[PDB]
Amino acid sequence: SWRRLVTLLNRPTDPASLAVFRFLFGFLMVLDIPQERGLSSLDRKYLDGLDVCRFPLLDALRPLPLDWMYLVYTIMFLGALGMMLGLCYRISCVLFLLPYWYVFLLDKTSWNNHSYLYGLLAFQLTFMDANHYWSVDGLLNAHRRNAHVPLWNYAVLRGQIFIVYFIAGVKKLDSIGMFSYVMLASSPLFCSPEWPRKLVSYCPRRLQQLLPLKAAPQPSVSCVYKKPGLRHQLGAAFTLLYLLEQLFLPYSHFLTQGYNNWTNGLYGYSWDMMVHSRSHQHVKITYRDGRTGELGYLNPGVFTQSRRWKDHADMLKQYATCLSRLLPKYNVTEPQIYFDIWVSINDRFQQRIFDPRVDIVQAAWSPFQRTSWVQPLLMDLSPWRAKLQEIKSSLDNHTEVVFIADFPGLHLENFVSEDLGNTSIQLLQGEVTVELVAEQKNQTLREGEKMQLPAGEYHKVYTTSPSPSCYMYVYVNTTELALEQDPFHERFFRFLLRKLYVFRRSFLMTCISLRNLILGRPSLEQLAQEVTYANLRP
Ligand SMILES: *[C@@H]1O[C@H](CO)[C@@H](O[C@@H]2O[C@H](CO)[C@@H](O)[C@H](O)[C@H]2NC(C)=O)[C@H](O)[C@H]1NC(C)=O
Ligand SMILES: CC(C)CCC[C@@H](C)[C@H]1CC[C@H]2[C@@H]3CC=C4C[C@@H](O)CC[C@]4(C)[C@H]3CC[C@]12C
């Protein structure tokens, strides 16, 4: 039944094994905020007046100024200090939740599969009665001291670490930070909740006085004892209706079709490590100048701080709309920015990921509709990616080859160097014409046809086929071949002095930038002595 279900989920359980996990997550979010969340490096990241192209999830999330942004990581650290102790716990979770999902939703490049877990585990632990055992609220309130907690404090937490352990096994069918310690600290949730009363019995008698209470736990208000109420019934709409989306959001890719791509899509909730096989031999930002039509080949990573905008279609459009307002400061009024990104596969198969003729500033991208201007990965060329081993094994060590796949209307202007003598082409699928601009002659190639190329010149290979044409570049470095023819006990001490710079610089710079709100701004020559005070090694 439904009334029988909520009586099961609100059954009084022991509050102790939740309260170790409240501590060991609240303590591992004390070590985390200096190291990984970037309190050591907010100054170079959210600097005042600096033109940086952000990548937030919602585009209305504009980051605060750096005077205020050191307060947001302080409320996060005041929140993760009361969630450590268990102090003022329904406020110290909301002071850790709301400035985490403002920080974590502010940088799409900062998403991964462990810093999304802490944004989940701080959302469950906000609604949970974790401060019943071993708290300060227990040492200030009697009815929050060693009192029985409902089972949905344990059923959700056993169901969240189940799904992370389950979907990461199912996603295998196709320097990680604190993740190696939280999943070791979360493993005492799957044990019986009597385990923090077992090791204190193995402890001596005099050590039992600073350790918390050992007796049998009292009943509480928040349970159903052998009909439930409004607090009790919403623990059954949070046990399942939260765990339903946690079984659904890793497979919510086909509804967020503006985000998803060839391999992963929007990284974060996937639970599977991303592959580094791309290696990206090209980017070419090509903007049209306003009102003149002139061409500017812009530098690739000018107004960004990460290289995640090239592998994904969502971060490109936000980078193409942030560049659409910055470039008027450099005499480019209305830019028409066309990206030409050659995503390379592990050793071969170089092909574009975005359409280089379309204006990414104006072209429509909706988060649930299909993205139009993404070129598809040629998965018909994945049996040709097995055909590479036919060509690789038949050829020797000194003939190196990369493969190219090209779409209609496009061309690859490549410069063969002086080192790459005896360089040939083989057009496999489709029809392309190779034109040497030094020789000014077109030559239409046929399927399987072999043709050499001159060294030290440019060449343009235009696609005239209506199908995606593909070809390969056998090359030999003839000048390189003519060159061939002629302690642990002190590492951790070095690791300790590294991390004590992180704790010192993050603590010192926070109090400097908190002075500007309460005590106003100092002089520029005053703070110059203050900022180099922190950057030194202690
Ligand atoms: C070789 O022939 C191709 C096919 O006509 C030429 O490519 C076209 O060039 C014109 C003018 O430059 C462009 O307007 C077309 O868009 C091009 N076609 C495609 C499919 O891009 C190419 O210019 C010729 N080679 C040289 C060196 O001139
Ligand atoms: C932006 C400032 C004001 C804070 C506002 C709070 C918002 C942005 C945050 C706080 C906690 C967040 C939720 C925490 C947990 C989850 C489960 C996850 O699987 C999907 C997102 C979802 C459902 C989040 C949605 C957005 C959320 C409600």
Closest to 454 in 3D by CA, of 421, 427, 490, 495: 421
Atom of ligand 2 nearest to the CA of 102: 1
Nearest listed ligand to the Cα of residue 466: 1
* DSSP label of 374: B
Q: Quick one: angle between helices 66-85 and 488-518, nearest 10?
A: 120
Verify whether ligand 2 is closer than 6 Å to residue 102 (CB atom): yes
> DSSP state, 304?
-
Contact 96, 81 (CB under 8 A): no
Q: Which two tokens stand for residue 425?
A: 């082409």
Element (H, E) at 212: none
Q: Please say whether the beta carbons of 14 and 146 come within 8 A.
A: no
Q: Is the dihedral of CA 386, 173, 314, 330 positive or negative?
A: negative
- Cα-based distances in Å from 455 to 121, 195, 434, 436, 471: 59, 73, 14, 11, 19
Cα 47 to Cα 448: distance, rounded to the nearest angstrom? 55
| Cα(415) to centroid(ligand 1), Å | 18
User: Whose alpha carbon is nearest atom 1 of ligand 1?
Assistant: 442
Instruction: Say which DSSP state 342 is in.
Output: E
- Residue 320's Cβ-side half-sphere holds a number of Cα atoms within 13 Å equal to 27
- In sequence order, the β-bridge partners of residue 436 are 441
Query: What DSSP line would sit under 420-481, residue for residue?
Result: --SEEEEEEES-EEEEETTTTEEEE--TT-EEEE-TTSEEEEEE--SS-EEEEEEE--HHHH
Query: Ligand 1: does its nearest atom lie under 6 Å from the Cβ of 437?
Result: yes
**CA 184 → CA 24, 189, 296, 516, distances in Å?**
10, 10, 52, 41
Q: Are 402 and 472 in contact (CB under 8 A)?
A: yes
**Distance, first Cα to last Cα, the chain:** 63
Written as one letter, the residue type at 66 is L
Q: Which of 382, 374, 437, 435 is nearest to 405 (CA)?
A: 382
Kindly report each contact of residues 163-168 with a partner whose C-beta sits within 8 Å and lies 24 or more positions away, as own/partner: 163/243, 163/246, 163/247, 163/250, 163/271, 164/117, 164/271, 167/250, 167/271, 167/272, 168/271, 168/272
Angle 27-85-162 from CA coordinates, rounded to 5°? 55
Q: In sequence order, what are the residues at sequence separation of 6 or more whose Cβ sits closer than 8 angstroms to the Cβ of residue 198?
A: none
CA dist 302 and 313 (Å) reads 18
Instruction: Give the distance, in angstroms, between the CA of residue 374 and the centroid of all CA atoms in the same chain.
Output: 21
Alpha-carbon gap, residue 236 to 230, rounded angstroms: 11
**Cβ proximity of 5 and 91 under 8 Å:** no
CB 48 within 8 A of CB 100: no
C-alpha–C-alpha distance, residues 496 and 30, integer Å: 16
Cα 144 to ligand 2 centre (Å):
27
What's the 101 CA to ligand 2 centre distance in angstroms? 6
The CATH number given to 384-485 is 2.60.120.10
Sign of CA dihedral 383, 388, 390, 393: negative
Of 371, 335, 380, nearest in space to 353 by CA: 371
Q: According to the entry, how was the structure determined?
A: cryo-EM
Q: Cα–Cα distance between 399 and 420 in angstroms, integer?
A: 11
Widest distance between CA atoms in the chain: 93
Is ligand 2 within 6 A of the CB of residue 101? Answer: yes
Q: Whose CA is nearest to atom 21 of ligand 1?
A: 409
Burial environment of residue 389 by CB neighbours within 10 A (0 to 12, 13 to 18, 19 or more): exposed
Interhelix angle 16-26/66-85, nearest 10 degrees = 150
Contacts of residue 534, defined as CB under 8 A and 6 or more positions apart, other chains included, come to 504, 505, 508, 509, 512
Ligand 1 centre distance from Cα of residue 35 (Å): 53
Judge if the beta carbon of residue 333 lies within 6 A of ligand 1.
Answer: no
Residue 415 host element (H or E): strand 411-415
In angstroms, the CA 256 to CA 367 distance is 6
What token pair was written down for 354? 């975005």
CA atoms within 13 A on the CB side of 91: 5
Inter-residue long-range contacts of 526-534, CB under 8 Å, 24+ positions, other chains counted: 531/43, 533/508, 534/504, 534/505, 534/508, 534/509
Contact between 55 and 108 under an 8 Å Cβ cutoff? The reply is: yes
Question: Which of 410, 435, 467 to probe ligand 1 with, by most ligand atoms within 8 A of CB?
Answer: 435
**Cβ–ligand 2 contact at 242 (below 6 Å):** no
Q: In terms of residues, how long is the chain?
A: 538
443 neighbors 451 (Cβ within 8 angstroms): yes
DSSP string, 144-190: TSSB-EETHHHHHHHHHHHHHHHHHHHGGG---TTHHHHHHHSGGGT
Which residue's C-alpha comes closest to atom 6 of ligand 1?
462
Residue 357 CA neighbour count, 13 Å, CB half: 6
Answer whether 218 contacts ligand 1 (Cβ < 6 A): no
Q: Resolution in Å, one decimal, please.
A: 3.6
CA angle 124, 129, 135 (to 5 degrees): 115
Rounded CA-CA distance 243/431 in Å is: 52
Q: Residue 73: which H helix or E strand, with range?
A: helix 66-85
Distance CA 93, CA 105 (A): 18
Place of tokens 């190329």: 453
Residue with tokens 């951790």: 492
- For ligand 1, the distance from its centroid to the CA atom of residue 216, given in whole angstroms, is 85
d(CA 228, CA 511): 48
Extended strands (E) in 217-284: none
Domain ranges of the chain: 3-47+59-251, 285-375, 384-485, 488-535
Element (H, E) at 13: strand 12-13
- The four Cα atoms 43, 49, 55, 56 give a dihedral, to 10 degrees, of 90
- Residue 47's identity, in one-letter code, is L
Phi, psi of 286 (to 5 degrees): -130, 95
CA of 390 to the centre of ligand 2 (A): 51
Is the sign of the CA dihedral 239, 244, 249, 255 positive or negative? negative
Q: Which ligand lies nearest to the CA atom of residue 56 in the structure? A: 2
Q: How far is Cα 57 from Cα 375, in angstroms, rounded to an integer?
A: 23
Distance 306 CA to ligand 2 centre (A): 24
Beta bridge partners of 147: 218
Q: Which residues neighbour 73 within 8 Å (Cβ) at sequence distance 6 or greater?
A: 33, 37, 39, 42, 99, 103, 510
Query: In terms of DSSP bridges, do strands 342-343 and 400-406 run parallel, antiparallel, or are they unpaired?
Result: unpaired
**How remote is the C-alpha of 423 from its chain's centroid?**
40
Decide: 508 and 534 in contact? Cβ < 8 Å: yes
Which protein residue's CA is at the shortest distance from atom 20 of ligand 1?
Answer: 409
DSSP per residue, 345-358: PSSS-EEESB-TTS
3-state secondary structure of 218: strand
**Side-chain half-sphere exposure of 523, counting CA atoms within 13 A:** 3
Say if ligand 2 is within 6 A of residue 162 CB: no
Give the integer Cα–Cα distance in Å for 364 and 66: 33
For the annotated catalytic residues, the residue numbers are: 172
- How far is residue 452's CA from residue 106's CA, in Å, rounded to a whole number? 51
Pocket test for ligand 1, best of 410, 462, 463, 464 (most atoms within 8 A of CB): 462
258 and 365 Cβ atoms separated by less than 8 Å: yes
Token pair for 42: 């907010």
